[PDB]
Write a protein that binds this ligand. Structure first.
Ligand SMILES: [Mg+2]
Ligand SMILES: [Mg+2]
Ligand SMILES: [Mg+2]
Ligand SMILES: [Mg+2]
Ligand SMILES: [Mg+2]
Ligand SMILES: [Mg+2]
Ligand SMILES: [Mg+2]
Ligand SMILES: [Mg+2]
Ligand SMILES: [Mg+2]
Ligand SMILES: [Mg+2]
Ligand SMILES: [Mg+2]
Ligand SMILES: [Mg+2]
Ligand SMILES: [Mg+2]
Ligand SMILES: [Mg+2]
Ligand SMILES: [Mg+2]
Ligand SMILES: [Mg+2]
Ligand SMILES: [Zn+2]
Lengths: 304, 148, 166, 211, 287, 152, 108
RNA sequence: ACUGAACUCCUCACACCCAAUUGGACCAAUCUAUCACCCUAUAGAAGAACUAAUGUUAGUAUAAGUAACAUGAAAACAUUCU
């Protein structure tokens, strides 16, 4: 007989266990707010060739943004909700080309996780995260596991790859999935309006692999590349990414610095391990803007 | 065929040749009808040849039953409990002398397939091959890419 | 028609000795000409083939299929004749050792198709066979570990012979 | 069904009309529905002559000997399930009352020597003789299962049995056979049984409650 | 030797079972009415000193075997594997009843006795472990206690975490063995025959025999281990699902010898908890 | 693809599904307890609680009289909706109906369900109780609460 | 389109005996504490709900007797009372459905 | 140089690899004559032998538990509603 946590509790204990476990969740999250008052791993400066951490954010939704040339740039909002570094493995024990950080996002109930996973976060000192994503990273960027990661890890002007699971569309047919033209409506056309036509040729007595057929469209990891950060909102930990992000609203995206060969040496001015508000040097404003971004509160712009 | 039929190894009963040879055939059981053309050459075998056969090997005890049978049989029973029942139905006297002598000569092993044509129980005398025959040892028992 | 399964509750054994373990009872009960098919009865018959009778009654009170109620009738009837006729002291102390289902004598009806052509429907009947055995249910077979596979592979390596020679 | 009246009322409701047909052959019974006068344990010489005028050679001073030999031999036929002998030894009113429930189970009843001289008790009387006999014996039972495992009484230990065995005779070819066996309400209970019994209470419909 | 203590004590336990069963009047048969809320009014016409309440459950269903844990035999708590005595009325008591007070108490006592069964077979051969008692600790206190006296060598000893983890591994190993609890209502004299080599349990049986108008003392057994208790117990070791030996404390008025009290907490197969709720019940059971 | 489509398509159209929910809602305003298949039960639960929320607008509100005139196919139930059901529930703001599952229908094996209105004269359903507070685990957690009240 | 050959019983047994076609052993099943008939979790006990259904059936029959004809739904709340029970001080101004049996142990 | 056949040798045994066709030796079961008598013998006869005719009749498979099929709703099963 499989059980669950709400099963054997009376009405007296259910709000007690809800409020109590939620209170240890908020206390364990708020205990990580002093990473530099702990003993962190030593902070190295940036080097040409080094890679750093990403984030895991929520896709809040979209909103328009206008540059000082008076142009709409549609902007996705990505809220960084309780992102943390979970484990560091070097390239020795990873046996890849590069080191790796497991980084997790969006705290989730402790009653819906496997006991091995709850031993992992019980050792770590955190409530369990929904997603763990793994970042290839060099030895220069290696923060202690358990350190909070904020939105000012990225700065405006930076170009960013964002990956996610796209919106699942289920078993879709040929025209919606692969964009095939289908058949005419009238002029005969008995039972073909949305069907694939031929598949292969008669001499090939089989169908080639990778043939476009109906099947489950969506619900897979894709990555959008080279997306400019226009604005970060420090108080609510929002990234204002250009354009469109894969995935539905309130989905968790994996936000890392862009791999594009035109944007591979602009980390000279970015905070290289991560941004530390514990470091207390020149505390950031409410909201960081790119040079082009027409701020609200600025007067109505003139092109003269 | 051989995959539908069982098989066995070539053996004897109690090391049948080593010390002495023991006749492996205990009992013959003839059942021969008095009036009937099926057991005619059986009757002529009892009148002529079963007495001289019974004297040529006294370790076999023979039971001629002489009941109204409709097919005559001979039932050879062997020292190991094996019982081979073969029919002497409409067979001449010479063919029953070769048949009964065939049952006398053999043993109570099965007439299923024999796998090997031979049976040593001590096949190797100079010591069987293992992969370290025909390999010289090295000094201090060292293996390749071993320094000390 | 053969009806050999009703006879199997009639086999009387000679009385035992003091130096002999207690024999578990065996209870053969079946129903004939159930209007249901023989391979929709295979899933319900297969479901309960090692469970105890209280567990099987629990699994058949809550299954949506038609045969579950009929098999629960057979199991309740065999529990009652288990206690009365067959000297089984505890009702709970019974497991289903065999639960099969043969086919019954079916009927043949005419199914009309789209032209003068037609087909031959069968009104499908089945049976349902049960041997209950007194005792705790046997434990499920544990899956063999890497110790068992390792000993089996090494036992095959120890088994082998130089072949096609002396 | 449960009785004749339910089959007759379902014969009227179903419409199956069974006309009562008359046949010249009736059933030649050889028994009685029980006892003519039930002897109650803690003058009937007219019935003795009512036996001697049909039988003409009958001695009661020799009868409880034969009553023993009719008794024990009949129970010996339970050791072997010799029903062919039993219908010569026992009546038809007694034969299901002693052979039905013993089906599919081996009994190993065994007599050992009596404790009292068995004796006649009363005699009553188309004509059905009837002799009740008092016996006080020592018997051993061992009733097994289909599976040959003991469920009533050890085989070795003898028990002492009170027996009010009622005999009946058809009075041209019949003999004395065990008709019934009076069990009195003052008698002690029998042996206890090796196993335990659950006895269910009232099976409740949902609208019903238990009181 | 402790192996000799198992041989001699278990043989005295078997002499008490032999002189306990051989006074039966050759299978006398007493009936017991199932007084309960459900399946009401079924008499069990059962054997006198052979049948248990578990046999009544085996007449009803496998559900009443697996789920039911104590039996109110005429208003008193009774073990499911205790032999009955006379005509009576049986309730069956589970953990999920409306007022499961005696079931919680019997689970408490059973877990303490399993704990002492782990402690006495925990140490190496050169350390004398000497179990005194289990105090009747309420369930709200969060942990069943078991007072233990050790040797003077370990007067300055305190176990690590992995010692307690080895105690839990031995206790879960004792759960996996699936051992029933043999029970015997014995007079005081044979209980003093069994526990004559432990002065604390001699005084404990002297406490229990004088409490009653008879000299009657309950005795229990798991497997090769005999212990005294105050009330009934669980039917089996298989019911304890979660089990942890949480901590060890030392008592404060220890002038003669350390009465070193061990702490445990456990939940059945029926009242399981989640991993986080169970870790918090471990954080509470170390006091 | 039906992301965010929140209405069960039923019946033989949108019109006939609103007549199905209108007949079920009429039957539950009348009898105050209904066995029905489960999807129709929770669809009609969504309509039933809003129907009381129009019941609280008052007898005199002509919009709510048009609504209750639509949704109640029997006309006697409209004084029951404005004088019985709406004063019964004026204390609370939501949670008017309760739903439980029946064992499945013996005809076709459909997922059945009951919704009743809370607080009526009918024999109350065998509601699923929590485990009582005196069980072993609830007393361990009661001990944990009695400690963590003593930490202030 | 027609099958080119006939599927065999070894292939068919591999199809219709895999665990995707077999019936799952379910573990939702409990014992109802009020009745002891084994119920299922998340679903009411059929025996206890059959009690409630039969009593609501007799109550609605007496409702149908005391109203009389269709379209007689009262503007008045209802109270079911059993034999040997006074209508409450709270039941003033409510219609009364007198029953014939006793108050159940489970009606309150 | 070795490998390499159903060729050839070797130990024993030999009537024992072609279509259509043709020659010959035997022979299952059945019945008849006469023996026989847990199933046979010598003859005589004949509706005298089926892995194949989109063969016929019956059984049961496969396709397949598939295609298809069927009950408006609540309720006191009085009734009402759509
Ligand atoms: Mg078209
Ligand atoms: Mg066309
Ligand atoms: Mg068919
Ligand atoms: Mg539909
Ligand atoms: Mg060669
Ligand atoms: Mg050649
Ligand atoms: Mg040749
Ligand atoms: Mg012939
Ligand atoms: Mg022909
Ligand atoms: Mg054929
Ligand atoms: Mg051919
Ligand atoms: Mg053919
Ligand atoms: Mg099929
Ligand atoms: Mg179907
Ligand atoms: Mg198909
Ligand atoms: Mg279909
Ligand atoms: Zn219930």
């Amino acid at each position: 007989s499989g059980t669950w946590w709400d099963e054997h509790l009376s009405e007296e204990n259910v709000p007690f266990i809800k409020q109590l476990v939620s209170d240890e969740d908020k206390a364990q999250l708020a205990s990580k707010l002093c990473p530099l008052k702990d003993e962190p791993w030593p902070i190295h400066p940036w080097e040409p060739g080094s890679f750093r951490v990403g984030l895991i954010a929520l896709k809040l939704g979209m909103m328009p943004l206008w540059t000082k040339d008076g142009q709409k740039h549609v902007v996705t909002l990505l809220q960084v909700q309780d992102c943390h570094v979970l484990k560091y493995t070097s390239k020795e024990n990873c046996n890849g080309k590069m080191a790796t950080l497991s980084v997790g996002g969006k705290t989730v109930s402790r009653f819906r996780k496997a006991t091995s996973i709850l031993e992992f976060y019980r050792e770590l000192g955190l409530p369990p995260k929904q997603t763990v994503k793994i970042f290839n990273i060099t030895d220069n960027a290696a923060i202690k596991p358990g350190t909070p990661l904020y939105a000012a890890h990225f700065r405006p002007g930076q170009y960013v790859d964002v990956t996610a699971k796209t919106i699942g569309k289920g078993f879709q047919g040929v025209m919606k999935r692969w964009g095939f033209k289908g058949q005419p409506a009238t002029h005969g056309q008995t039972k073909t309006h949305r069907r694939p036509g031929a598949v292969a040729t008669g001499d090939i007595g089989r169908v080639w692999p990778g043939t476009k057929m109906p099947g489950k469209m969506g619900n897979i990891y894709r990555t959008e590349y080279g997306l400019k950060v226009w604005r970060i909102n420090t108080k609510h930990n929002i990234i204002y990414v250009n354009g469109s992000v894969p995935g539905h609203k309130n989905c968790l995206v994996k936000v890392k610095d862009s791999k594009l060969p035109a944007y591979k040496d602009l980390g000279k001015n970015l905070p290289f391990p991560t941004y530390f508000p514990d470091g207390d040097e020149e505390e950031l404003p409410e909201d960081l803007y790119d040079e082009n971004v027409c701020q609200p509160g600025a007067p109505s712009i003139t092109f003269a | 065929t051989a995959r539908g039929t069982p098989s066995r190894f070539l053996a004897s009963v109690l090391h049948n040749g080593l010390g002495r040879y023991v006749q492996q055939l205990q009992r013959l059981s003839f059942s021969v009808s008095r009036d009937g053309a099926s057991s005619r050459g059986a009757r002529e075998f009892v009148e002529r040849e079963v007495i001289d056969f019974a004297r040529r090997n006294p370790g076999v005890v023979i039971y001629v039953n002489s009941r109204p049978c409709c097919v005559p049989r001979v039932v050879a029973e062997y020292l190991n409990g094996a019982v081979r029942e073969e029919s002497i139905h409409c067979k001449s006297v010479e063919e029953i002398s070769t048949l009964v002598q065939k049952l006398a000569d053999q043993s109570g092993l099965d007439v299923i397939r024999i796998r090997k044509p031979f049976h040593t129980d001590n096949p190797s005398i100079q010591g069987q091959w293992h992969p370290f025959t025909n390999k010289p040892t090295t000094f201090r028992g060292l293996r390749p890419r071993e320094v000390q | 028609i053969s009806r050999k399964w009703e006879k199997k509750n009639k086999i009387v054994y000679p009385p035992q000795l003091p130096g002999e373990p207690r024999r578990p009872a065996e209870i053969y009960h079946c129903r004939r000409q159930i209007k249901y098919s023989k391979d929709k009865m295979w899933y319900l018959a297969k479901l309960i083939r090692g469970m105890s009778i209280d567990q099987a009654l629990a699994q058949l009170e809550f299954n949506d299929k038609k045969g579950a109620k009929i098999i629960k009738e057979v199991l309740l009837e065999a529990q009652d004749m288990a206690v009365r006729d067959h000297n089984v002291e505890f009702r709970s102390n019974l497991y289903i050792a065999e639960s099969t289902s043969g086919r019954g004598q079916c009927l043949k009806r005419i199914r009309y198709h789209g032209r003068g052509r037609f087909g031959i429907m069968e009104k499908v009947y089945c049976h349902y066979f049960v041997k209950l055995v007194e005792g705790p249910p046997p434990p499920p077979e544990p899956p063999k570990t890497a110790v068992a596979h390792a000993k089996e592979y090494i036992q095959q390596l120890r088994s082998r012979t130089i072949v096609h020679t002396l | 069904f449960k009785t004749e009246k339910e089959f007759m009322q379902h014969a009227r409701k179903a419409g199956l009309v069974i006309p009562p047909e008359k046949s010249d052959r009736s059933i030649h019974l050889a028994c009685t529905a029980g006892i003519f006068d039930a002897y109650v344990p803690p003058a009937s010489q007219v019935s003795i002559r009512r036996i001697k005028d049909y039988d003409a050679n009958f001695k009661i001073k020799d009868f409880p000997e034969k009553a023993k030999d009719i008794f024990i031999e009949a129970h010996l036929c339970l050791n072997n399930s010799d029903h062919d002998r039993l219908h010569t030894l026992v009546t038809e009113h007694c034969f299901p009352d002693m052979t039905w429930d013993i089906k599919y189970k081996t009994v190993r009843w065994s007599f050992v020597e009596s404790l009292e001289p068995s004796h006649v008790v009363q005699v009553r009387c188309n004509v059905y003789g009837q002799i009740t006999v008092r016996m006080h014996t020592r018997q051993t039972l061992a009733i097994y299962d289909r599976f040959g495992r003991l469920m009533y009484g050890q085989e070795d230990v003898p028990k002492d049995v009170l027996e009010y065995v009622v005999f009946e005779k058809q009075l041209p070819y019949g003999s004395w056979r065990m008709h019934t066996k009076i069990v009195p309400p003052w008698a002690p209970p029998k042996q206890p049984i090796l196993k335990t019994v659950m006895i269910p209470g009232p099976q409740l419909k949902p609208e019903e409650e238990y009181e | 030797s402790p192996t000799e203590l198992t041989e001699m004590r278990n043989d005295l336990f078997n002499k008490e079972k032999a002189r306990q069963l051989s006074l039966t009047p050759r299978t006398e048969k007493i009936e017991v009415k199932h007084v309960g809320k459900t399946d009401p009014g079924t008499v069990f016409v059962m054997n006198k000193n052979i049948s248990t309440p578990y046999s009544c459950a085996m007449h009803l269903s496998e559900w009443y075997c697996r789920k039911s844990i104590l039996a109110l035999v005429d208003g008193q708590p009774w073990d499911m594997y205790k032999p009955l005595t006379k005509s009576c009325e049986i309730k069956f008591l589970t953990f999920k009843d409306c007022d499961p007070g005696e079931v919680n108490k019997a689970y408490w006592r059973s877990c303490a006795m399993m704990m002492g069964c782990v402690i006495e077979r925990a140490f190496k051969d050169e350390y004398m472990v000497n179990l005194v008692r289990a105090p009747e600790v309420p369930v709200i206190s969060g942990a069943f206690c078991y007072d233990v006296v050790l040797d003077s060598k370990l007067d300055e000893w305190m176990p690590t975490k992995e010692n307690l983890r080895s105690f839990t591994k031995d206790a879960h190993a004792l759960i996996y063995k699936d051992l029933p609890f043999e029970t015997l209502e014995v007079e005081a004299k044979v209980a003093l025959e069994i526990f004559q080599h432990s002065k604390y349990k001699v005084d404990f049986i002297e406490e229990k025999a004088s409490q009653n108008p008879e000299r009657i003392v309950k005795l229990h057994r798991i497997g090769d281990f005999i212990d005294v208790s105050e009330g009934p117990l669980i039917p089996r070791t298989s019911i304890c699902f979660q089990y942890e030996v949480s901590a060890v404390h030392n008592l404060q008025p220890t002038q003669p010898s350390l009465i070193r009290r061990f702490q445990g907490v456990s939940l059945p197969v029926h009242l399981r908890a989640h991993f986080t709720i169970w870790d918090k019940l471990l954080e509470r059971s170390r006091k | 693809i039906s992301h965010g489509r929140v209405f069960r398509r039923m019946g033989l159209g949108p019109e006939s599904r609103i007549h199905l929910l209108r007949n079920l809602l009429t039957g539950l305003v009348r009898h105050e307890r209904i066995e029905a298949p489960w999807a129709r039960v929770d669809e009609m639960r969504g309509y039933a609680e809003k129907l009381i929320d129009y019941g609280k607008l008052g007898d005199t509100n002509e919009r709510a009289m048009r609504m209750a005139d639509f949704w109640l196919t029997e006309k006697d139930l409209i004084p029951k909706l404005f004088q019985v059901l709406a004063p019964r529930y004026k204390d609370q703001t939501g949670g008017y109906t309760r739903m439980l599952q029946i064992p499945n229908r013996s005809l076709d094996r459909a997922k059945m369900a009951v919704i009743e209105y809370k607080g009526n004269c009918l024999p109350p359903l065998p509601l699923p109780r929590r485990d009582s507070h005196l069980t072993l685990l609830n007393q361990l957690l009661q001990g944990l609460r009695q400690d963590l009240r003593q930490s202030q | 389109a027609a099958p080119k050959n006939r599927r065999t019983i070894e292939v068919n047994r591999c199809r219709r005996r895999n665990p995707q076609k077999l019936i799952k052993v379910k573990n939702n099943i409990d014992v109802c504490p009020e009745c002891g008939h084994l119920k299922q979790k998340h679903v009411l006990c059929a025996y206890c709900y059959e009690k409630v259904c039969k009593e609501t059936a007799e109550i609605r029959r007496q409702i149908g007797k005391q109203e009389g004809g269709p379209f007689k739904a009262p503007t008045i709340e209802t109270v079911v009372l059993y034999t040997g029970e006074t209508p409450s001080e709270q039941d003033q101004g409510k219609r009364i459905i007198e029953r014939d049996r006793k108050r159940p142990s489970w009606f309150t």
